[PDB]
PDB file of C-alpha atoms and ligand atoms in Angstrom:
ATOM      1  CA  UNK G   1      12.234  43.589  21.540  1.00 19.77           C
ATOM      2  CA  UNK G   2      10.265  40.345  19.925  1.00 23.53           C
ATOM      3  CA  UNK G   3      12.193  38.285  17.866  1.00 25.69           C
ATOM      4  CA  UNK G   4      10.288  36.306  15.123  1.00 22.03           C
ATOM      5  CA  UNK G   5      10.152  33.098  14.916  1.00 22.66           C
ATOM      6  CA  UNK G   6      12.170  31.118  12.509  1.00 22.81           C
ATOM      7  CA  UNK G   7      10.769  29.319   9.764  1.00 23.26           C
ATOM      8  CA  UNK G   8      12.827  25.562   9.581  1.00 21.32           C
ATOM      9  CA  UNK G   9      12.486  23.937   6.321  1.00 21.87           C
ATOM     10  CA  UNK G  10      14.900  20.574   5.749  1.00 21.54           C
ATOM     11  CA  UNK G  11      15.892  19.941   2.035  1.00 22.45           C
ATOM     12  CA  UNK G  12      15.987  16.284   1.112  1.00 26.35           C
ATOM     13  CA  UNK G  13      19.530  14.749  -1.095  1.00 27.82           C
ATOM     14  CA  UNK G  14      19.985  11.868  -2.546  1.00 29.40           C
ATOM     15  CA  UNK G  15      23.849  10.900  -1.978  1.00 27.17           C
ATOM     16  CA  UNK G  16      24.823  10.824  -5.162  1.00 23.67           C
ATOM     17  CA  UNK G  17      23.095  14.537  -4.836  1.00 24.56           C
ATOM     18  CA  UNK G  18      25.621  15.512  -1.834  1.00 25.88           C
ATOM     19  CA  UNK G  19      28.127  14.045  -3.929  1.00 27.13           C
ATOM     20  CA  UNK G  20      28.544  16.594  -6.735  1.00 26.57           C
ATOM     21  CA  UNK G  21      26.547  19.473  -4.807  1.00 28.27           C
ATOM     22  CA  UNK G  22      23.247  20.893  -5.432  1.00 30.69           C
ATOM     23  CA  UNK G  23      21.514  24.175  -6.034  1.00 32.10           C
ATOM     24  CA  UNK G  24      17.637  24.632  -5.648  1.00 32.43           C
ATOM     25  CA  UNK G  25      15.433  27.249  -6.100  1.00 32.12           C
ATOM     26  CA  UNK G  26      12.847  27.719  -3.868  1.00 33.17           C
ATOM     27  CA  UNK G  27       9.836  29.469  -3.098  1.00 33.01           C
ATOM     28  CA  UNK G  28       9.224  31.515  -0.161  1.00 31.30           C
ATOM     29  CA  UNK G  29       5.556  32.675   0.813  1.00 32.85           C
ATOM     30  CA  UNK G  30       5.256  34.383   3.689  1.00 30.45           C
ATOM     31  CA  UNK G  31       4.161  37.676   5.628  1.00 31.49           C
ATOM     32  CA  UNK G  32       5.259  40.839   4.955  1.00 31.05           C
ATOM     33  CA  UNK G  33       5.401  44.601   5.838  1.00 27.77           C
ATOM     34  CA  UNK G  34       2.672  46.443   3.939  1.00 29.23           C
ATOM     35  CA  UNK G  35       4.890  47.927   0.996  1.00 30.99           C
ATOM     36  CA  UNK G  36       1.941  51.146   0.800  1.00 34.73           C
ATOM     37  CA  UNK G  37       2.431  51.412   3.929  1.00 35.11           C
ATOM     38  CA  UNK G  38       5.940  50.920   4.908  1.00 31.30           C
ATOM     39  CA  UNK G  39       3.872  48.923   7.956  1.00 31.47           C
ATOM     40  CA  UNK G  40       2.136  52.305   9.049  1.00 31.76           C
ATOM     41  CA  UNK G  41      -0.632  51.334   8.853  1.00 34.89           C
ATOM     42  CA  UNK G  42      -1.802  54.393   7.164  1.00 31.01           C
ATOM     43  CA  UNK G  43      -0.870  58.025   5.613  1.00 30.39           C
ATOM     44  CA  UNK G  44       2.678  59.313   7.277  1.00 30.62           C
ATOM     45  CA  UNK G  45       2.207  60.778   9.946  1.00 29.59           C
ATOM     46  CA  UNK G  46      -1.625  60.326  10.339  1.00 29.17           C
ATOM     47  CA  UNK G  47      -2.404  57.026  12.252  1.00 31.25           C
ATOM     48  CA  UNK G  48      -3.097  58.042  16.255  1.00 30.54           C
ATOM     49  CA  UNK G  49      -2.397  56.249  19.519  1.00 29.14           C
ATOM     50  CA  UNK G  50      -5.501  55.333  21.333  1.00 24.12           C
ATOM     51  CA  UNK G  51      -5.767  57.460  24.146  1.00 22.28           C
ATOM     52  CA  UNK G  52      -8.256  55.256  26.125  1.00 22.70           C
ATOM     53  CA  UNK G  53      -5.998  51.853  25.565  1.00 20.77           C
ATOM     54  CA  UNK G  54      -2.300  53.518  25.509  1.00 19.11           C
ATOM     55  CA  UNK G  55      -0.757  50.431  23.330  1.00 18.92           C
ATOM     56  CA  UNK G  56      -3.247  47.282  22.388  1.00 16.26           C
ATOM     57  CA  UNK G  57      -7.129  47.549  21.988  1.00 16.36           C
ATOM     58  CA  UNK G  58      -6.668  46.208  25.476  1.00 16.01           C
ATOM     59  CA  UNK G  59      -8.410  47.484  29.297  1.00 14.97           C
ATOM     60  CA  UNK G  60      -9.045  46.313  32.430  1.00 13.52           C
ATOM     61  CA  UNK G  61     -12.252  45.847  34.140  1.00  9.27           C
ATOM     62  CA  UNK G  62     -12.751  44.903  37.416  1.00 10.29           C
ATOM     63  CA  UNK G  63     -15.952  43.347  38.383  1.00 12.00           C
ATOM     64  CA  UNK G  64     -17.194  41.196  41.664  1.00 13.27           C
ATOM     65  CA  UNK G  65     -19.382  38.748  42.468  1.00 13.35           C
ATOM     66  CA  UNK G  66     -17.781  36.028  45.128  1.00 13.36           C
ATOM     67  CA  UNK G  67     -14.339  37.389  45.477  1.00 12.52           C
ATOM     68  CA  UNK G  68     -13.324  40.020  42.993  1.00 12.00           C
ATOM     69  CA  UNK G  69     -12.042  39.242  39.497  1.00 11.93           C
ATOM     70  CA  UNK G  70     -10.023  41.716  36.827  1.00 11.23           C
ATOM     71  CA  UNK G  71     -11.800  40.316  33.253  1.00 13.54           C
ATOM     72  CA  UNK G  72      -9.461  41.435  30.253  1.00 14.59           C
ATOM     73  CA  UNK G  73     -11.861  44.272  28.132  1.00 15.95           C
ATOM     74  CA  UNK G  74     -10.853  43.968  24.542  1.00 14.34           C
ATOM     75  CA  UNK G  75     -11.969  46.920  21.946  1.00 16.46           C
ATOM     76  CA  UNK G  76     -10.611  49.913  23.376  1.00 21.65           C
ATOM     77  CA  UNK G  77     -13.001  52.523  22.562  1.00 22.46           C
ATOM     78  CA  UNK G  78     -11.926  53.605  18.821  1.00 25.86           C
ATOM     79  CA  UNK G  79      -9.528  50.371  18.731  1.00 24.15           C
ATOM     80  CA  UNK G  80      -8.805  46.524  19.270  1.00 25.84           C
ATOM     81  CA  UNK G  81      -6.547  44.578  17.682  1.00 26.78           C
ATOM     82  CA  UNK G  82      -5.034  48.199  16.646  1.00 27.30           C
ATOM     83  CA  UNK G  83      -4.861  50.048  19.438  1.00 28.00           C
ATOM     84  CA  UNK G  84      -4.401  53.737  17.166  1.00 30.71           C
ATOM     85  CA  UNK G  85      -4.653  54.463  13.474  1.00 29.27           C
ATOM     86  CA  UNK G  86      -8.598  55.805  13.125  1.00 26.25           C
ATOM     87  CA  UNK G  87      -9.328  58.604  10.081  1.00 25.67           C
ATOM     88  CA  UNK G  88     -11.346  57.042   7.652  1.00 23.93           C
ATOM     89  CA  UNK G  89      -9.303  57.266   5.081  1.00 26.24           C
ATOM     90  CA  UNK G  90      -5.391  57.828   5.540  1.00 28.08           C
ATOM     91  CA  UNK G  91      -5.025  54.350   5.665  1.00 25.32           C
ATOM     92  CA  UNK G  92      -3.679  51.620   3.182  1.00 22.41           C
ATOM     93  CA  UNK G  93      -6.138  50.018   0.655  1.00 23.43           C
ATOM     94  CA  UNK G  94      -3.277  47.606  -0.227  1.00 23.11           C
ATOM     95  CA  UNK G  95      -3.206  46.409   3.578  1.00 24.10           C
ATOM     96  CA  UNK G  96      -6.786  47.927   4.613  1.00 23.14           C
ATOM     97  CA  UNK G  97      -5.136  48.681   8.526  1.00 24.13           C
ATOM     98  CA  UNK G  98      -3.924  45.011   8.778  1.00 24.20           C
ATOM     99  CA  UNK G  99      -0.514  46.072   8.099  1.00 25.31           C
ATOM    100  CA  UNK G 100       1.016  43.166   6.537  1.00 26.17           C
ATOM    101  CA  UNK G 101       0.307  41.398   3.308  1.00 24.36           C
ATOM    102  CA  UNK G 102       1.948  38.082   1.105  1.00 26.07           C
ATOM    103  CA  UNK G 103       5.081  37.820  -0.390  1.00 27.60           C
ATOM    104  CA  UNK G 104       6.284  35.308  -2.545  1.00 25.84           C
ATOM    105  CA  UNK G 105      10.115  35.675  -3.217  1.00 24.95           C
ATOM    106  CA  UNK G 106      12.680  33.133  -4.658  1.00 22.19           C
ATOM    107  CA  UNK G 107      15.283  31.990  -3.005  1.00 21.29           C
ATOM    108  CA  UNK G 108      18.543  29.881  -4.380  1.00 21.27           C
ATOM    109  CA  UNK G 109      20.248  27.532  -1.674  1.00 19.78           C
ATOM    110  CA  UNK G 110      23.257  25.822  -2.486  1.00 22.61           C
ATOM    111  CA  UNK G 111      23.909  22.093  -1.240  1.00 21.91           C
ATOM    112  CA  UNK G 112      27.607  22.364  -1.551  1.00 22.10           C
ATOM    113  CA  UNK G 113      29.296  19.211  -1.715  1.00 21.30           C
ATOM    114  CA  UNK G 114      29.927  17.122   1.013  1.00 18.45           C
ATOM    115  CA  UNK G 115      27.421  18.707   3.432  1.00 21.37           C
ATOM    116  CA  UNK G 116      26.366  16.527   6.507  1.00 20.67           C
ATOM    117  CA  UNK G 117      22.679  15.458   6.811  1.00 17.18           C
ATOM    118  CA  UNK G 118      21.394  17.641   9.807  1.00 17.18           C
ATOM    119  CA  UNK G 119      23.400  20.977   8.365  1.00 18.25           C
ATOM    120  CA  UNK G 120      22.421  23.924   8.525  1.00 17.44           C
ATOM    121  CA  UNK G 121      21.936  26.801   6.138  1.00 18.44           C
ATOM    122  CA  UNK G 122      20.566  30.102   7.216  1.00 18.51           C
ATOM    123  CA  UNK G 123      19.108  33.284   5.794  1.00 18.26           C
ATOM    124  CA  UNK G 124      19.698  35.739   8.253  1.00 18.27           C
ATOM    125  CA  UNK G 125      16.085  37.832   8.646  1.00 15.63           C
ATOM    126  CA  UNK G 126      14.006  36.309   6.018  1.00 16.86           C
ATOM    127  CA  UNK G 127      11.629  34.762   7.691  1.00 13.70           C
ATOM    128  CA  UNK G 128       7.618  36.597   8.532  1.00 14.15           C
ATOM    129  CA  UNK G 129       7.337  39.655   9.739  1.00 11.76           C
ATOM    130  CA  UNK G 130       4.976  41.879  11.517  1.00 13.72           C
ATOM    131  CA  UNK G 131       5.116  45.781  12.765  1.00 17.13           C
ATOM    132  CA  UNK G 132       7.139  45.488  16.273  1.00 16.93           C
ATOM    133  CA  UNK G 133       8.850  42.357  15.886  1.00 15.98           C
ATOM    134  CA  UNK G 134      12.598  41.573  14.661  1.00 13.58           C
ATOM    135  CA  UNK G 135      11.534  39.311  11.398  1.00 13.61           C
ATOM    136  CA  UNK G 136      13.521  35.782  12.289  1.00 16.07           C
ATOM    137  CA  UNK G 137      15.595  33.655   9.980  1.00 14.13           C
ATOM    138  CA  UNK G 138      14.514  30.770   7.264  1.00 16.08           C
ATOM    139  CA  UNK G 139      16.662  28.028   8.397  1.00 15.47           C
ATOM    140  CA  UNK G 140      17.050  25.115   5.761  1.00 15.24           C
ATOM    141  CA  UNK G 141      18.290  21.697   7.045  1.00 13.31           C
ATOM    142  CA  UNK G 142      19.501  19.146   4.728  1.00 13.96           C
ATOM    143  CA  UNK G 143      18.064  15.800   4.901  1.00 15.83           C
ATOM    144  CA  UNK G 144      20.287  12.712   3.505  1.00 18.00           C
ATOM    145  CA  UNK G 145      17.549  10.511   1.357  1.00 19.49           C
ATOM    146  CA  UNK G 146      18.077   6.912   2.104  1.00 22.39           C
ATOM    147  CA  UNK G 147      20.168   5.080  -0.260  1.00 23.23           C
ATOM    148  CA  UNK G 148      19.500   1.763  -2.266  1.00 21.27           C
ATOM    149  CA  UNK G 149      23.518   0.478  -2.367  1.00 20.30           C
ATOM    150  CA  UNK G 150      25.203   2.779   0.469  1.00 20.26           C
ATOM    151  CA  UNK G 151      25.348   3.971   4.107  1.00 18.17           C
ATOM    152  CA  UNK G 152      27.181   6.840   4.967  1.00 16.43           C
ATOM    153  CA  UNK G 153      29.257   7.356   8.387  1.00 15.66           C
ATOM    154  CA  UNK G 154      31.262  10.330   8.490  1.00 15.03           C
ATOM    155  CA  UNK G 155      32.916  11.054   5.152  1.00 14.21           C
ATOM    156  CA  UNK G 156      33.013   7.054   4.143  1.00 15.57           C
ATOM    157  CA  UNK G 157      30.706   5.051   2.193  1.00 16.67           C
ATOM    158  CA  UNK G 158      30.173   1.374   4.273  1.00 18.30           C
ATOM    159  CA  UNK G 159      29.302  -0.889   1.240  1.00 17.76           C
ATOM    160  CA  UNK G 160      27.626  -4.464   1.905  1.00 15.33           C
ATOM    161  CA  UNK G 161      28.663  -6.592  -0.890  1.00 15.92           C
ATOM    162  CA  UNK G 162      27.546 -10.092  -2.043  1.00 18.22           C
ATOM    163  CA  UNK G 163      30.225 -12.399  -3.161  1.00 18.42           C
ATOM    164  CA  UNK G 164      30.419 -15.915  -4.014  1.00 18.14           C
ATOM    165  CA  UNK G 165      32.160 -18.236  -1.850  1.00 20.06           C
ATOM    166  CA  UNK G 166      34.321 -19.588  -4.429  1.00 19.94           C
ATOM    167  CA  UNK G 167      35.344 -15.968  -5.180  1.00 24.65           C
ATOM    168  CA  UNK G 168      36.155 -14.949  -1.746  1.00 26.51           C
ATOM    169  CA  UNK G 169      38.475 -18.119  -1.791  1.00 26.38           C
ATOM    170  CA  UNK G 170      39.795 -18.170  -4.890  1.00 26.86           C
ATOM    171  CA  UNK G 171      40.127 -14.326  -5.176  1.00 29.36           C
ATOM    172  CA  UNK G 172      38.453 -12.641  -8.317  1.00 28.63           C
ATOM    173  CA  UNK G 173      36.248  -9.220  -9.482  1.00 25.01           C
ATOM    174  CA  UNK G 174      33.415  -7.176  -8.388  1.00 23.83           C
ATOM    175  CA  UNK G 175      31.609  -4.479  -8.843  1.00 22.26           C
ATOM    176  CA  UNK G 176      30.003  -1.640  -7.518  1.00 20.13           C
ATOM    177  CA  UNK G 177      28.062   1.492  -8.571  1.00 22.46           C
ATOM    178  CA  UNK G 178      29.765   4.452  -6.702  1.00 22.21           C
ATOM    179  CA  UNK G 179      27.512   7.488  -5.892  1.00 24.49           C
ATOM    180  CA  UNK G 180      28.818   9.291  -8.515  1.00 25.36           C
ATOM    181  CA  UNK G 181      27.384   7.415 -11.996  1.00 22.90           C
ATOM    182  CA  UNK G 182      30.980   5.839 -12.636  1.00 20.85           C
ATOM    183  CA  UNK G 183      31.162   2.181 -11.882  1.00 22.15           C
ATOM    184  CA  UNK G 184      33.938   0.517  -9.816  1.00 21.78           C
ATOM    185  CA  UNK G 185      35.714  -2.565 -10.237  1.00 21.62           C
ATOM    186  CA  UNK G 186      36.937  -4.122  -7.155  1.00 26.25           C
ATOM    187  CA  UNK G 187      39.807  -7.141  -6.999  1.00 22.56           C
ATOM    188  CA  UNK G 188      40.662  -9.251  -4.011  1.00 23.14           C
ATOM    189  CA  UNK G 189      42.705 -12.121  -3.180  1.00 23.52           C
ATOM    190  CA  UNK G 190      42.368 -15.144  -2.175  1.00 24.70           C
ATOM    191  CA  UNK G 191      41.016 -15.341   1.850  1.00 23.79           C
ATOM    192  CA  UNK G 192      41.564 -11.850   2.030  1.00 23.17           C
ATOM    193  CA  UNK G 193      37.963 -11.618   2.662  1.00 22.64           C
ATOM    194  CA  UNK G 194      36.561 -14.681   4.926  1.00 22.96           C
ATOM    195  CA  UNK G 195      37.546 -13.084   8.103  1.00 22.81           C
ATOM    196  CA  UNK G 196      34.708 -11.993  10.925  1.00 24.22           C
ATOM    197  CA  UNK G 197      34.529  -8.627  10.909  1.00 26.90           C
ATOM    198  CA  UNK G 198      36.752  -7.906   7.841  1.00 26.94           C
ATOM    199  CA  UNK G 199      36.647  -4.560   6.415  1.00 26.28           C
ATOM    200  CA  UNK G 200      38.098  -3.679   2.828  1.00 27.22           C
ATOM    201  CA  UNK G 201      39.103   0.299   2.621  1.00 26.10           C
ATOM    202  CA  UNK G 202      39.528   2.047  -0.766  1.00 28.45           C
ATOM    203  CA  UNK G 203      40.966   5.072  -0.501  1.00 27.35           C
ATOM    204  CA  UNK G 204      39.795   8.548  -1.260  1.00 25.72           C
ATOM    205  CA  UNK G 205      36.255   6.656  -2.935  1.00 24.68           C
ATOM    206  CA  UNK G 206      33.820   7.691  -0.283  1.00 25.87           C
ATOM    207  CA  UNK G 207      32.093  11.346  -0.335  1.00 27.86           C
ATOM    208  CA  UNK G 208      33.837  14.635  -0.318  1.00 27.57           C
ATOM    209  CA  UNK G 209      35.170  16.699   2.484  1.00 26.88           C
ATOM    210  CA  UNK G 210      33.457  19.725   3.746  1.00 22.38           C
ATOM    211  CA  UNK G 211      36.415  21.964   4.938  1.00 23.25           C
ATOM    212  CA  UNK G 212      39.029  20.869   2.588  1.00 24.41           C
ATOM    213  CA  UNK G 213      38.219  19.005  -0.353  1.00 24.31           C
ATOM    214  CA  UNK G 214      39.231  14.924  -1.218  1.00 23.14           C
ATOM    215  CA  UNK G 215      37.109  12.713  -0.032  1.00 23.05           C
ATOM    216  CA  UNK G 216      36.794   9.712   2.615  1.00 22.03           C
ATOM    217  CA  UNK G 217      37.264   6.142   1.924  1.00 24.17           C
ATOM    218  CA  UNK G 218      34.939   3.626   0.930  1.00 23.68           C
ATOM    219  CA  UNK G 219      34.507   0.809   3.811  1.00 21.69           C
ATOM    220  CA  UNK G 220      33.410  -2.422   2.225  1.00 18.54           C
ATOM    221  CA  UNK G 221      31.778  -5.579   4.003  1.00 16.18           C
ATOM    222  CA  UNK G 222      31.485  -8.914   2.603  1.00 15.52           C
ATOM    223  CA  UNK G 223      28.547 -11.118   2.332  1.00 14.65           C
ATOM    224  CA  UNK G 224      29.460 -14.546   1.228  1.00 15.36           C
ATOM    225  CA  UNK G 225      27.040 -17.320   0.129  1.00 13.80           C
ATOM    226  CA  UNK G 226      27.551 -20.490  -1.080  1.00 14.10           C
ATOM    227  CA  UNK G 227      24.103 -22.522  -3.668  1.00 12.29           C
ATOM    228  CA  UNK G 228      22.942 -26.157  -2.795  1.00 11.78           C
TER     229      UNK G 228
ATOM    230  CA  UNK Q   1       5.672  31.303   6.644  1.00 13.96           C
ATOM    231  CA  UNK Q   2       6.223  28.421   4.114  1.00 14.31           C
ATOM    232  CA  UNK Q   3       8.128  27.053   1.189  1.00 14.85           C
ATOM    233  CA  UNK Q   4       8.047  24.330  -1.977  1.00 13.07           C
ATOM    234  CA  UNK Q   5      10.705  23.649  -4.618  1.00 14.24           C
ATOM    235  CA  UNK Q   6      10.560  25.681  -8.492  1.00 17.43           C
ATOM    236  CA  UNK Q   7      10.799  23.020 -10.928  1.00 16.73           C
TER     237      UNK Q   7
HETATM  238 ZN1  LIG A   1      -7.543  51.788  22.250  1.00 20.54          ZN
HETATM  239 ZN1  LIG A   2      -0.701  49.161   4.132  1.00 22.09          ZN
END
């Protein structure tokens, strides 16, 4: 009977952050139930429906002129915007009648490794509420940070690596700086790398697996330039 | 409803 809206807030990651898995504490500020109240809106058991608007300060008057036209009446008598409550004083002081007040509450969301830019993680009924509706959910999304080095597709890394020509013919080293602080040596021989198109695959050296564990493989490309 | 990082 009125859900709330949901509150969507997307949590940025570096990959080397998705890598090992984060945790972050954040702060939540939102609208809440008056706690002296309970969202009453005053004493228990004193606020009173308003008899001459029987929900919302809200009536109906119908006036004419050329053709006849029904003009929405707002303050209902002893009401508007609260169509009950009244007695002086049986209500809050710590929410004055408005029935809500601020809340700022921590919460800890963990980036578990692996996790997809796009995910989602949700907290089920945190999000604002007011008296009547169903409070909705605080829905973080995590955002993959672009990267200086990589590009991620799936769980693979796709690497674009400069090498020498004489390198790529004669075969040699290389280096990389994986997403996790270790460095990686690469070898390759001789033409293996000239090829249009060619594609070198390491093995389990590209980001870890959601449901499982592992990791992908880490796709590289070859850039070859030759001085003079 | 909104939110900011502690730290
Ligand atoms: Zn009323
Ligand atoms: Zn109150």
């Amino acid at each position: 009977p009125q859900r709330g809206k949901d509150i969507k807030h997307e949590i940025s990651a570096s990959l080397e952050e998705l890598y090992k898995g984060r945790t972050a504490k954040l702060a939540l500020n939102k609208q809440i139930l008056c706690k002296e109240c309970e969202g009453r809106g005053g004493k228990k058991g004193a606020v009173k429906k308003c008899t001459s608007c029987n929900g919302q300060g809200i009536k109906f008057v119908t006036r004419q002129m050329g053709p006849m036209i029904q003009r929405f009446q707002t303050e209902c008598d002893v009401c508007h915007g609260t169509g009950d409550i009244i007695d002086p004083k049986d209500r809050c002081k710590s929410c004055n009648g408005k029935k809500v007040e601020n809340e700022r509450k921590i919460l800890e969301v963990h980036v578990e490794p692996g996790m997809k830019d796009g995910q989602r993680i949700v907290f089920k009924g945190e999000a604002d509420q007011a008296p009547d509706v169903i409070p909705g959910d605080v829905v973080f999304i995590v955002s993959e940070r672009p990267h200086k080095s990589f590009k991620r597709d799936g769980d693979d890394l796709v690497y674009e690596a400069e090498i020498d020509l004489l390198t790529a013919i004669a075969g040699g080293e290389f280096a990389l700086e994986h997403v996790s602080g270790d460095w990686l040596k690469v070898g390759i021989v001789p033409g293996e790398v000239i090829a249009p198109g060619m594609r070198k695959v390491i093995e389990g050296k590209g980001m870890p697996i959601p449901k499982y564990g592992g990791y992908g493989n880490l796709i590289i490309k070859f850039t070859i330039k030759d001085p003079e | 409803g909104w939110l900011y990082e502690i730290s």
